[PDB]
Amino acid sequence: HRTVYLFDRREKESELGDRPLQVGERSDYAGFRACVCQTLGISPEEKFVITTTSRKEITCDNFDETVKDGVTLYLLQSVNQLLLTATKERIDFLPHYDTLVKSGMYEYYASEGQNPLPFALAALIDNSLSATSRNIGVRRIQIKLLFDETQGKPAVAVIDNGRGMTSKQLNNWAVYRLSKFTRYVRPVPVPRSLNSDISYFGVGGKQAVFFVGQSARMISKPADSQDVHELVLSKEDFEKKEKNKEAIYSGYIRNRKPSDSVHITNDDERFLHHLIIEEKEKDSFTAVVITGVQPEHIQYLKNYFHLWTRQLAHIYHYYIHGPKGNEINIDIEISMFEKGKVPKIVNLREIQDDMQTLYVNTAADSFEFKAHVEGDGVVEGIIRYHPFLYDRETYPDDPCFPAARGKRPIFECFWNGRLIPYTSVEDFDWCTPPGLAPIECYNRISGALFTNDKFQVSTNKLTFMDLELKLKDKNTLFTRILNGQEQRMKIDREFALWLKDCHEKYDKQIKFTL
Amino acid sequence: RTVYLFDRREKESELGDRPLQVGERSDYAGFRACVCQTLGFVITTTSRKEITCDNFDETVKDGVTLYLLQSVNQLLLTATKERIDFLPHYDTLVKSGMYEYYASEGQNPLPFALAALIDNSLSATSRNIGVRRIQIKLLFDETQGKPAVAVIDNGRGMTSKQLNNWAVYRLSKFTRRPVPVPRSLNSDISYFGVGGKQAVFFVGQSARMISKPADSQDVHELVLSKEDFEKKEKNKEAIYSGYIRNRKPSDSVHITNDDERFLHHLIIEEKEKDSFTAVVITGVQPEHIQYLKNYFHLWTRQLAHIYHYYIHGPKGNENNIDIEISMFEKGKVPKIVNLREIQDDMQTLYVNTAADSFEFKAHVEGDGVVEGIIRYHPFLYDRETYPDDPCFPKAARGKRPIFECFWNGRLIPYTSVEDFDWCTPPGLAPIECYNRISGALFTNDKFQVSTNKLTFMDLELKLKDKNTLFTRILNGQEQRMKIDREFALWLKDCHEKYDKQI
Ligand SMILES: Nc1ncnc2c1ncn2[C@@H]1O[C@H](COP(=O)(O)OP(=O)(O)OP(=O)(O)O)[C@@H](O)[C@H]1O
Ligand SMILES: Nc1ncnc2c1ncn2[C@@H]1O[C@H](COP(=O)(O)OP(=O)(O)OP(=O)(O)O)[C@@H](O)[C@H]1O
Ligand SMILES: [Mg+2]
Ligand SMILES: [Mg+2]
């Protein structure tokens, strides 16, 4: 049985409403037309016509190809009669499954001399940070690059010991654009907004997995749950469901006891048996297993291991090292496996040449402030002084920007504690050179800005929407943070005086002639 | 009301599930009795919450999966399969443009949303015989109802089926290729199946699509709106089901609220058109209205810049496309401009202050070819003529990048290329001549852009790749010279010919 919707539009006064019509398999136009004449009281002496909404007339030849399930049909005196009264033609407009499969394909663009693949990994780290935010003890977040072909096909796995997901929460995860606002306890403010409350849009994890690869296997277990819940979303399963005319967004969660990998029969996915065996220890976990990894991603992760782990340490510097930075707990552990090589392992806390560590440890002093923007948003700011010592500047180098800072921007920008990589602020009026402090001192300052969600970011969290615009608005008030207290100030003069004091206390102009 | 029951008492229990039809008026004991009868403990949800008559109605709903177990916390001997639906949330549409148009390089990004709708009209009018009329009407006169933004073209329009397709997020031309032309001004700008929906839901909260093909006697009208999605959700109706209204041209009887008064004057004009599409955005955010009202000359120049080469052709502003903008305010004269009238958009300034040009192609391994042009702006007696750029308030170009970048003929606003090696100062030509050159790069779709079409994905990285071959185009033939010395020579000639001291 397939339903069609018939509008009688022979005369203006014809019934406004449509008449639905159940049509069984292997029926013909003559049968269809007879029923119409009978129910509606129409002599088979009327020369009326039946047309689609495009005015294509139904005939015996085209009946089966034209009268499909769901179509709307017109009863007309003639094929091109004037539509005296308006019709309502039912439609379905379900999003195409590429809403998921292509959600990350054209989002992570390259900018400022950076490879964006680690930003997809950061999206998954963000999820694990939120999931581990109330852990008693260690918050463990592992990224395993299973690129050893003696264990199966390449796979990227992100595993944490967070709170995990129920069947329902795992169902929610699969819903594109289902966020914490739609499916929530807004956290109490905290310095640098290191609150682990990084989610906003309900899409980031899906963009990441389908950017990295073509199939995601979610494995999760809350502490309360006896059972492990497992859900696969993949390009292959959508294509299969399309070809077989099955519901595109229907599937099933596999519930199972911990450590049971009997459902893994693909030898390509061998490595999953060992991942699933590891579940016995864990009271609560989530594992994101990505397969169908694009070859260009694998080659970058193999050949630039020190660079892209550094990028991640840079992004999560203040989550790793706390609000003061790495003045030289969360364990973010990367491990990569290749045929013929010892496992490569690094805890991001080990990394010492990420840009923030260099800024923090080459700084002689700092200048701390807040910016109060119209709309009640508050930005935390820090400026750091990197002094000239005898014969050299100490402002650290940045490989993306091959006398001290140069033409580089002063400020890196952080949102809920993590770096937003493609938004920098060059300077403000009050920290550019006009004077009361020597000009070259304005080139010795680096900085960081910290917001919470009051300042919007783009969906991919690569950029702020309008951070600089709001900070430089005429109504924005700047305050100084000193000894824990916040106070209004005359910032142009008070920053200059701070800069002059830094020059006199820290800059050293003594050198043996060459 | 169907539930799916898994018998999981023993390791040998039946693997498959047994669907049970639980009537609407049924009890826990009744249900329990039906279970004992059908198969031969406790019953739980998939979270091991035990079914009781206290929770029976809040727990045994249509479509749920249930467990038959010896105890609540018995280990699962055999794995179950729990049916789920995961339809995208309707914010997949309503919020599709809310966090996509970020500000960069001092530009307000609102006109980029209008460019997305212009791109659609360029493609819809690509085979028009005669004029291609693309109108943007800002109906901000409150005597005619609430604010609205309308984009109206005289293109091919949409059938009922094509209008249905337009409402499918991510339904593209690939899941439903012109011949190469200069600067890829091919009007084949679509790719992703989302741009138009991001634009309307960035600008406002409701989109009325009105369309009519020439081969169609009826007009097709479809509304997508935040308010409609919210009503369907409240009433538990299918989220992605609606209807297309089909009507005769110029019939506006369905418009009954005074706040949409303006639509009568808009629909009356359908008499005059064989084919058309009208996008009508309502629920316009107040901040978009304020910007559009107070910076008319700025944001219309932005659109002329973006579409310079579609307006003026492949040589620039030294065609049958009429992009007309009109804004209506209470007690004011209509503001009206054809983008072809604008003369101080950046590309016009580059084209007209240029004394000579240097043309070239970049061949990127993988069949991708980029067309490029560099323009020389001389020093005339006592000033540089390199045009100023309000986004950027070495005396000529200064720190600005050389190259603006175009994709299928239209500007990509947030992708610039500062320079290449062969056109950066080393001296076969005075150093300061290298600061007097602007340029533009043109690609087709062989070079990827992001979904919102604000940036290229990896244009600069591929252009600077060591395998990339740079060839000059002189007259109409490809010359095989070493571009770097060829360009330094061209820059000497330009200096010795166009720079003036007296
Ligand atoms: N590692 C995890 N542990 C527990 N729950 C998770 C994990 N990853 C994802 N989820 C759940 O799935 C949901 C969807 O995640 P996704 O990253 O797609 O969107 P989001 O994080 O909510 O928003 P955003 O788009 O800002 O990332 C999350 O809100 C979270 O509840
Ligand atoms: N003004 C118009 N006239 C005729 N058809 C249109 C018009 N606007 C949109 N369409 C149809 O609706 C479809 C969806 O448009 P939308 O802009 O959402 O995606 P797209 O243009 O296909 O891809 P992209 O995301 O690259 O813009 C278009 O492909 C086109 O077929
Ligand atoms: Mg997320
Ligand atoms: Mg489009």
PDB file of N, CA, C and O in Angstrom, chain B residues 195-242:
ATOM      1  N   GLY B 195      24.761  26.243   1.362  1.00  0.00           N
ATOM      2  CA  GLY B 195      25.053  27.665   1.490  1.00  0.00           C
ATOM      3  C   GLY B 195      23.813  28.526   1.641  1.00  0.00           C
ATOM      4  O   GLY B 195      23.759  29.417   2.492  1.00  0.00           O
ATOM      5  N   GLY B 196      22.802  28.279   0.807  1.00  0.00           N
ATOM      6  CA  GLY B 196      21.598  29.087   0.865  1.00  0.00           C
ATOM      7  C   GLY B 196      20.874  28.988   2.192  1.00  0.00           C
ATOM      8  O   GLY B 196      20.265  29.961   2.645  1.00  0.00           O
ATOM      9  N   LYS B 197      20.926  27.821   2.836  1.00  0.00           N
ATOM     10  CA  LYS B 197      20.240  27.653   4.111  1.00  0.00           C
ATOM     11  C   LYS B 197      20.999  28.333   5.244  1.00  0.00           C
ATOM     12  O   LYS B 197      20.384  28.910   6.148  1.00  0.00           O
ATOM     13  N   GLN B 198      22.331  28.284   5.214  1.00  0.00           N
ATOM     14  CA  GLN B 198      23.111  29.049   6.181  1.00  0.00           C
ATOM     15  C   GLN B 198      22.797  30.534   6.079  1.00  0.00           C
ATOM     16  O   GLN B 198      22.626  31.216   7.097  1.00  0.00           O
ATOM     17  N   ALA B 199      22.704  31.048   4.852  1.00  0.00           N
ATOM     18  CA  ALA B 199      22.523  32.481   4.643  1.00  0.00           C
ATOM     19  C   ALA B 199      21.215  32.973   5.251  1.00  0.00           C
ATOM     20  O   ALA B 199      21.198  33.957   5.998  1.00  0.00           O
ATOM     21  N   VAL B 200      20.102  32.306   4.937  1.00  0.00           N
ATOM     22  CA  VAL B 200      18.807  32.809   5.381  1.00  0.00           C
ATOM     23  C   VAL B 200      18.665  32.692   6.891  1.00  0.00           C
ATOM     24  O   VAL B 200      18.070  33.564   7.532  1.00  0.00           O
ATOM     25  N   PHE B 201      19.205  31.633   7.491  1.00  0.00           N
ATOM     26  CA  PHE B 201      19.097  31.460   8.932  1.00  0.00           C
ATOM     27  C   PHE B 201      20.176  32.208   9.702  1.00  0.00           C
ATOM     28  O   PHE B 201      20.054  32.355  10.923  1.00  0.00           O
ATOM     29  N   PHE B 202      21.213  32.699   9.020  1.00  0.00           N
ATOM     30  CA  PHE B 202      22.054  33.741   9.600  1.00  0.00           C
ATOM     31  C   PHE B 202      21.326  35.082   9.606  1.00  0.00           C
ATOM     32  O   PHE B 202      21.267  35.767  10.635  1.00  0.00           O
ATOM     33  N   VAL B 203      20.754  35.465   8.462  1.00  0.00           N
ATOM     34  CA  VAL B 203      20.111  36.772   8.340  1.00  0.00           C
ATOM     35  C   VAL B 203      18.865  36.843   9.218  1.00  0.00           C
ATOM     36  O   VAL B 203      18.646  37.829   9.931  1.00  0.00           O
ATOM     37  N   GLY B 204      18.031  35.807   9.175  1.00  0.00           N
ATOM     38  CA  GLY B 204      16.811  35.797   9.954  1.00  0.00           C
ATOM     39  C   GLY B 204      16.448  34.423  10.474  1.00  0.00           C
ATOM     40  O   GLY B 204      17.311  33.549  10.614  1.00  0.00           O
ATOM     41  N   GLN B 205      15.162  34.228  10.762  1.00  0.00           N
ATOM     42  CA  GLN B 205      14.670  33.008  11.381  1.00  0.00           C
ATOM     43  C   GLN B 205      13.594  32.314  10.560  1.00  0.00           C
ATOM     44  O   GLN B 205      13.047  31.300  11.011  1.00  0.00           O
ATOM     45  N   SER B 206      13.274  32.825   9.373  1.00  0.00           N
ATOM     46  CA  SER B 206      12.235  32.246   8.534  1.00  0.00           C
ATOM     47  C   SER B 206      12.546  32.573   7.083  1.00  0.00           C
ATOM     48  O   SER B 206      12.938  33.698   6.766  1.00  0.00           O
ATOM     49  N   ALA B 207      12.371  31.587   6.210  1.00  0.00           N
ATOM     50  CA  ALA B 207      12.656  31.744   4.791  1.00  0.00           C
ATOM     51  C   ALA B 207      11.447  31.280   3.995  1.00  0.00           C
ATOM     52  O   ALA B 207      11.048  30.115   4.092  1.00  0.00           O
ATOM     53  N   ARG B 208      10.862  32.191   3.219  1.00  0.00           N
ATOM     54  CA  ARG B 208       9.781  31.864   2.294  1.00  0.00           C
ATOM     55  C   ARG B 208      10.369  31.791   0.890  1.00  0.00           C
ATOM     56  O   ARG B 208      10.767  32.812   0.321  1.00  0.00           O
ATOM     57  N   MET B 209      10.437  30.585   0.344  1.00  0.00           N
ATOM     58  CA  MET B 209      10.917  30.377  -1.013  1.00  0.00           C
ATOM     59  C   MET B 209       9.746  30.410  -1.983  1.00  0.00           C
ATOM     60  O   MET B 209       8.823  29.611  -1.862  1.00  0.00           O
ATOM     61  N   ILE B 210       9.787  31.331  -2.941  1.00  0.00           N
ATOM     62  CA  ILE B 210       8.770  31.442  -3.982  1.00  0.00           C
ATOM     63  C   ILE B 210       9.472  31.247  -5.317  1.00  0.00           C
ATOM     64  O   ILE B 210      10.423  31.972  -5.633  1.00  0.00           O
ATOM     65  N   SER B 211       9.012  30.273  -6.098  1.00  0.00           N
ATOM     66  CA  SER B 211       9.698  29.920  -7.331  1.00  0.00           C
ATOM     67  C   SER B 211       8.692  29.436  -8.365  1.00  0.00           C
ATOM     68  O   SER B 211       7.639  28.888  -8.026  1.00  0.00           O
ATOM     69  N   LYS B 212       9.039  29.638  -9.633  1.00  0.00           N
ATOM     70  CA  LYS B 212       8.207  29.224 -10.753  1.00  0.00           C
ATOM     71  C   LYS B 212       9.074  29.010 -11.987  1.00  0.00           C
ATOM     72  O   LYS B 212       9.628  29.978 -12.521  1.00  0.00           O
ATOM     73  N   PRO B 213       9.227  27.781 -12.471  1.00  0.00           N
ATOM     74  CA  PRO B 213       9.893  27.587 -13.764  1.00  0.00           C
ATOM     75  C   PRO B 213       9.049  28.145 -14.897  1.00  0.00           C
ATOM     76  O   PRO B 213       7.843  28.365 -14.763  1.00  0.00           O
ATOM     77  N   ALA B 214       9.706  28.379 -16.034  1.00  0.00           N
ATOM     78  CA  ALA B 214       8.984  28.861 -17.205  1.00  0.00           C
ATOM     79  C   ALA B 214       8.021  27.803 -17.726  1.00  0.00           C
ATOM     80  O   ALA B 214       6.929  28.129 -18.207  1.00  0.00           O
ATOM     81  N   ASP B 215       8.410  26.533 -17.638  1.00  0.00           N
ATOM     82  CA  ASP B 215       7.571  25.420 -18.061  1.00  0.00           C
ATOM     83  C   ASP B 215       6.527  25.024 -17.011  1.00  0.00           C
ATOM     84  O   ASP B 215       6.016  23.901 -17.064  1.00  0.00           O
ATOM     85  N   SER B 216       6.201  25.908 -16.069  1.00  0.00           N
ATOM     86  CA  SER B 216       5.251  25.610 -15.006  1.00  0.00           C
ATOM     87  C   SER B 216       4.179  26.687 -14.973  1.00  0.00           C
ATOM     88  O   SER B 216       4.491  27.882 -14.996  1.00  0.00           O
ATOM     89  N   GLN B 217       2.920  26.256 -14.921  1.00  0.00           N
ATOM     90  CA  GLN B 217       1.791  27.172 -14.829  1.00  0.00           C
ATOM     91  C   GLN B 217       1.501  27.598 -13.395  1.00  0.00           C
ATOM     92  O   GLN B 217       0.870  28.641 -13.189  1.00  0.00           O
ATOM     93  N   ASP B 218       1.948  26.826 -12.408  1.00  0.00           N
ATOM     94  CA  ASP B 218       1.750  27.140 -11.002  1.00  0.00           C
ATOM     95  C   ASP B 218       3.039  27.666 -10.379  1.00  0.00           C
ATOM     96  O   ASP B 218       4.145  27.388 -10.845  1.00  0.00           O
ATOM     97  N   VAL B 219       2.874  28.439  -9.308  1.00  0.00           N
ATOM     98  CA  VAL B 219       3.986  28.934  -8.503  1.00  0.00           C
ATOM     99  C   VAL B 219       4.098  28.057  -7.264  1.00  0.00           C
ATOM    100  O   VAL B 219       3.082  27.642  -6.692  1.00  0.00           O
ATOM    101  N   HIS B 220       5.331  27.771  -6.846  1.00  0.00           N
ATOM    102  CA  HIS B 220       5.602  26.881  -5.721  1.00  0.00           C
ATOM    103  C   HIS B 220       6.192  27.679  -4.565  1.00  0.00           C
ATOM    104  O   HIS B 220       7.143  28.444  -4.755  1.00  0.00           O
ATOM    105  N   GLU B 221       5.639  27.486  -3.371  1.00  0.00           N
ATOM    106  CA  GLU B 221       5.967  28.322  -2.222  1.00  0.00           C
ATOM    107  C   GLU B 221       6.194  27.440  -1.002  1.00  0.00           C
ATOM    108  O   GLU B 221       5.299  26.687  -0.605  1.00  0.00           O
ATOM    109  N   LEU B 222       7.380  27.546  -0.399  1.00  0.00           N
ATOM    110  CA  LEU B 222       7.759  26.727   0.748  1.00  0.00           C
ATOM    111  C   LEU B 222       8.364  27.607   1.831  1.00  0.00           C
ATOM    112  O   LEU B 222       9.248  28.423   1.551  1.00  0.00           O
ATOM    113  N   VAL B 223       7.890  27.439   3.063  1.00  0.00           N
ATOM    114  CA  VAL B 223       8.408  28.155   4.225  1.00  0.00           C
ATOM    115  C   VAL B 223       9.155  27.172   5.116  1.00  0.00           C
ATOM    116  O   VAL B 223       8.612  26.123   5.488  1.00  0.00           O
ATOM    117  N   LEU B 224      10.399  27.510   5.454  1.00  0.00           N
ATOM    118  CA  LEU B 224      11.120  26.901   6.565  1.00  0.00           C
ATOM    119  C   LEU B 224      11.362  27.976   7.612  1.00  0.00           C
ATOM    120  O   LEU B 224      11.829  29.069   7.281  1.00  0.00           O
ATOM    121  N   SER B 225      11.059  27.669   8.869  1.00  0.00           N
ATOM    122  CA  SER B 225      11.179  28.673   9.914  1.00  0.00           C
ATOM    123  C   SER B 225      11.454  28.010  11.254  1.00  0.00           C
ATOM    124  O   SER B 225      11.031  26.880  11.511  1.00  0.00           O
ATOM    125  N   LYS B 226      12.168  28.745  12.108  1.00  0.00           N
ATOM    126  CA  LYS B 226      12.385  28.308  13.481  1.00  0.00           C
ATOM    127  C   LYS B 226      11.060  28.069  14.192  1.00  0.00           C
ATOM    128  O   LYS B 226      10.907  27.085  14.928  1.00  0.00           O
ATOM    129  N   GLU B 227      10.089  28.960  13.982  1.00  0.00           N
ATOM    130  CA  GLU B 227       8.805  28.857  14.670  1.00  0.00           C
ATOM    131  C   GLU B 227       8.049  27.600  14.254  1.00  0.00           C
ATOM    132  O   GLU B 227       7.387  26.965  15.081  1.00  0.00           O
ATOM    133  N   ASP B 228       8.133  27.225  12.976  1.00  0.00           N
ATOM    134  CA  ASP B 228       7.449  26.021  12.517  1.00  0.00           C
ATOM    135  C   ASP B 228       8.092  24.769  13.105  1.00  0.00           C
ATOM    136  O   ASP B 228       7.389  23.857  13.557  1.00  0.00           O
ATOM    137  N   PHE B 229       9.426  24.702  13.109  1.00  0.00           N
ATOM    138  CA  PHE B 229      10.100  23.580  13.754  1.00  0.00           C
ATOM    139  C   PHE B 229       9.704  23.476  15.221  1.00  0.00           C
ATOM    140  O   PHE B 229       9.479  22.375  15.735  1.00  0.00           O
ATOM    141  N   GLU B 230       9.602  24.616  15.907  1.00  0.00           N
ATOM    142  CA  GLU B 230       9.260  24.602  17.324  1.00  0.00           C
ATOM    143  C   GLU B 230       7.837  24.103  17.547  1.00  0.00           C
ATOM    144  O   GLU B 230       7.569  23.387  18.519  1.00  0.00           O
ATOM    145  N   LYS B 231       6.912  24.468  16.658  1.00  0.00           N
ATOM    146  CA  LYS B 231       5.538  23.994  16.786  1.00  0.00           C
ATOM    147  C   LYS B 231       5.460  22.493  16.542  1.00  0.00           C
ATOM    148  O   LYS B 231       4.826  21.761  17.312  1.00  0.00           O
ATOM    149  N   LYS B 232       6.104  22.014  15.475  1.00  0.00           N
ATOM    150  CA  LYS B 232       6.087  20.585  15.184  1.00  0.00           C
ATOM    151  C   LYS B 232       6.663  19.784  16.344  1.00  0.00           C
ATOM    152  O   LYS B 232       6.148  18.714  16.686  1.00  0.00           O
ATOM    153  N   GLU B 233       7.722  20.293  16.973  1.00  0.00           N
ATOM    154  CA  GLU B 233       8.300  19.612  18.125  1.00  0.00           C
ATOM    155  C   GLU B 233       7.328  19.602  19.300  1.00  0.00           C
ATOM    156  O   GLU B 233       7.124  18.565  19.942  1.00  0.00           O
ATOM    157  N   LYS B 234       6.716  20.751  19.594  1.00  0.00           N
ATOM    158  CA  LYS B 234       5.763  20.827  20.697  1.00  0.00           C
ATOM    159  C   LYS B 234       4.598  19.867  20.488  1.00  0.00           C
ATOM    160  O   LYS B 234       4.128  19.234  21.441  1.00  0.00           O
ATOM    161  N   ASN B 235       4.116  19.751  19.253  1.00  0.00           N
ATOM    162  CA  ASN B 235       3.011  18.858  18.931  1.00  0.00           C
ATOM    163  C   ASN B 235       3.470  17.451  18.577  1.00  0.00           C
ATOM    164  O   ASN B 235       2.633  16.613  18.229  1.00  0.00           O
ATOM    165  N   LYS B 236       4.772  17.172  18.650  1.00  0.00           N
ATOM    166  CA  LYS B 236       5.297  15.831  18.406  1.00  0.00           C
ATOM    167  C   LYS B 236       5.016  15.380  16.974  1.00  0.00           C
ATOM    168  O   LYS B 236       4.699  14.217  16.720  1.00  0.00           O
ATOM    169  N   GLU B 237       5.138  16.309  16.034  1.00  0.00           N
ATOM    170  CA  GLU B 237       4.960  16.033  14.618  1.00  0.00           C
ATOM    171  C   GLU B 237       6.318  15.814  13.955  1.00  0.00           C
ATOM    172  O   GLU B 237       7.365  16.167  14.502  1.00  0.00           O
ATOM    173  N   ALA B 238       6.288  15.217  12.765  1.00  0.00           N
ATOM    174  CA  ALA B 238       7.525  14.929  12.047  1.00  0.00           C
ATOM    175  C   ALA B 238       8.273  16.222  11.744  1.00  0.00           C
ATOM    176  O   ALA B 238       7.724  17.145  11.136  1.00  0.00           O
ATOM    177  N   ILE B 239       9.540  16.277  12.162  1.00  0.00           N
ATOM    178  CA  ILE B 239      10.291  17.529  12.131  1.00  0.00           C
ATOM    179  C   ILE B 239      10.552  17.973  10.697  1.00  0.00           C
ATOM    180  O   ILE B 239      10.457  19.164  10.380  1.00  0.00           O
ATOM    181  N   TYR B 240      10.892  17.039   9.814  1.00  0.00           N
ATOM    182  CA  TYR B 240      11.242  17.369   8.435  1.00  0.00           C
ATOM    183  C   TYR B 240      10.118  17.044   7.461  1.00  0.00           C
ATOM    184  O   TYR B 240      10.359  16.627   6.325  1.00  0.00           O
ATOM    185  N   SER B 241       8.873  17.236   7.889  1.00  0.00           N
ATOM    186  CA  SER B 241       7.711  17.153   7.018  1.00  0.00           C
ATOM    187  C   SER B 241       7.011  18.505   6.981  1.00  0.00           C
ATOM    188  O   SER B 241       6.854  19.162   8.013  1.00  0.00           O
ATOM    189  N   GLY B 242       6.606  18.910   5.793  1.00  0.00           N
ATOM    190  CA  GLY B 242       5.840  20.128   5.614  1.00  0.00           C
ATOM    191  C   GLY B 242       5.074  20.030   4.318  1.00  0.00           C
ATOM    192  O   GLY B 242       4.746  18.934   3.858  1.00  0.00           O
TER     193      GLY B 242
END
